[PDB]
Write a protein that binds this ligand. Sequence first.
Ligand SMILES: CC(=O)N[C@H]1[C@@H](OP(=O)(O)OP(=O)(O)OC[C@H]2O[C@@H](n3ccc(=O)[nH]c3=O)[C@H](O)[C@@H]2O)O[C@H](CO)[C@@H](O)[C@@H]1O
Lengths: 695, 11
Amino acid sequence: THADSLNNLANIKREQGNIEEAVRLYRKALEVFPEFAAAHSNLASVLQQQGKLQEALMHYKEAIRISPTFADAYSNMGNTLKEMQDVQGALQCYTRAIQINPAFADAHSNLASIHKDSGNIPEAIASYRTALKLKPDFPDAYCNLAHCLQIVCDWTDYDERMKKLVSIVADQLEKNRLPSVHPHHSMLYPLSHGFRKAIAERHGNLCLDKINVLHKPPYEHPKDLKLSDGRLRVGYVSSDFGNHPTSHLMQSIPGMHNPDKFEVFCYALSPDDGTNFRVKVMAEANHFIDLSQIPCNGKAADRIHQDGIHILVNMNGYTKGARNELFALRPAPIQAMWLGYPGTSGALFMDYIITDQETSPAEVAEQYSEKLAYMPHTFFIGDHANMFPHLKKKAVIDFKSIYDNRIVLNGIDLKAFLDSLPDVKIVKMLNMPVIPMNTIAEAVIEMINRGQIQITINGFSISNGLATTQINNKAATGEEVPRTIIVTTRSQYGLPEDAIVYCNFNQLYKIDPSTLQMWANILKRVPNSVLWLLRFPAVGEPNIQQYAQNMGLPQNRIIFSPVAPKEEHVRRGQLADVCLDTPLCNGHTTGMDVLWAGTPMVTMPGETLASRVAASQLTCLGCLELIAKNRQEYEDIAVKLGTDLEYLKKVRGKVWKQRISSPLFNTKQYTMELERLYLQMWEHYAAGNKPDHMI
Amino acid sequence: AFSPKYLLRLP
Ligand SMILES: CC(=O)N[C@H]1[C@@H](OP(=O)(O)OP(=O)(O)OC[C@H]2O[C@@H](n3ccc(=O)[nH]c3=O)[C@H](O)[C@@H]2O)O[C@H](CO)[C@@H](O)[C@@H]1O
């Protein structure tokens, strides 16, 4: 038939990158044969680029109707349904296809993918493994399974797995195919900086293809601030305006911009989540736009053009909810990345990338497709100073006879409560109040031991640190500063009283075998020391425990605690002594949380930006001695902190002061420096100069 | 229930 010849031509032209002039080929084939089952399928498959989301569904349904045994249509339709948010149906599409064709590997891969998205990681691993058995040469399932194993810290045959992934990327990079490793995942695998940037470029090119269908003309960009009253118009685009780590770091910056010279636009790709974070940004920002009601990217980008944004800030990168297609349209002259994606976009539409020397040294350049944007001290900023000001000062209880990490008390009204106490003693490190083991301490201890929610002492509210959720739900989330006094103790989390507490509250995926070995060596060299981790996920606990047993560490040497609300999670940091940063993916936000707690953090900067973070932090903090230059230096620094107690006290004191003295948590300072950089870039663009590294 | 992992001895 003539339809078959048209079909084959269309497929070839599709591989030829001529989908624009190949979809027409598919169309002609369908016109020749209206009921061409195969032609209906593929034409929708190319439609999966974006086109009309339901347009693909129409062709897929017709293809399945014409040939009820077309398992390719079923699995593809399920994926198309996945983009449409119809999980209930996409799952049924995959299973429908699997039941028809049990040997269909792709359906098992997609079934595992949705399980993985839903969080049933073990089931995603199982289905992925079933897909690989059916089709071992299947990069997508392997990479996803490798990611799943990384998430649960399953390092069985780890090295070869890593090597296999690099080989897959090479082959897929040779053929210009879509790499199976997500650019966010690239930071977790040992790949050359070129490979990672190439993967980001390929993902960045994906949105370009889906925007060409609009054929939207170029966007006329302003060349002066005259139309804006000399005010630079900056639009912060993010889908995380709400209870998300991005908001917990920068919710204050929008309000801190100097309105005399700046006009702040907050474009939200997410609906209002009813959190005080969204409330704050919607109120303090000069303008807030819910692009979540503007699905069409062209429509949204056009709206950005109308507002007159001079600098557009991408706070998503290749994270969930990102709508980078809007940035592809170049709605603003200057476009730059900011917090949220710890990596390069590899895309032309991103002109700049905010960083700092330590985070992105000049030598580590060429790893970024974007021109570098220098931030005087650090690119990372935190709102802990505002979210948890009750942690600025703390108090302890003398259980035996100067322990600052066993029985700690926090509270805004702490000063008045202490003044009501008869025998308060002061230990100078400004200084730390200490409660002697008296009847008041006895009442507090009974509260903790009995697990009582709260007590009253001289009319003061005393809250058990583990029951903040039911005492004030808003406070536990960090939306509200607790209006009570909170008691936190090692006994709450089973930490040994007279023991060194090494901690790392990052997600377990940031842990790799070499990092675990380093920490194991630390524990062996430091007696009476324990490692404090989080069930995050909880399935990683057995894997970590087994690898410790193989490393010679008894079970009791590692203590696992469940994840806790933001306020409780940050409050627990005081209980520990030193935090061990994950060198593979330096704890970025978790590093801020621990530092606010006053807990020293030992880090080993790497080659990637994500690895180099938390070094910039420590640098800006003024605690350079906690940055290790190699594996041995990391081990030695951690071991000294655990053994030289006087050194630990001095370092913890320095962290305690620098967290407030150093311009690390000074949001107003950060905003002003950000405003400076903003201007610098504009001048460059005003004088016609194209993006060039700002340092 | 919902108490500390271990108790704290006290005279
Ligand atoms: C590797 C990675 O993904 N890095 C990103 C991450 O930093 P980071 O790695 O620190 O943060 P995560 O993606 O792991 O998110 C963890 C979040 O959960 C909180 N938490 C943690 C433990 C607990 O018991 N309870 C609790 O509430 C932490 O305070 C933090 O806000 O978020 C930042 C904020 O957008 C981004 O700029 C970083 O690029």
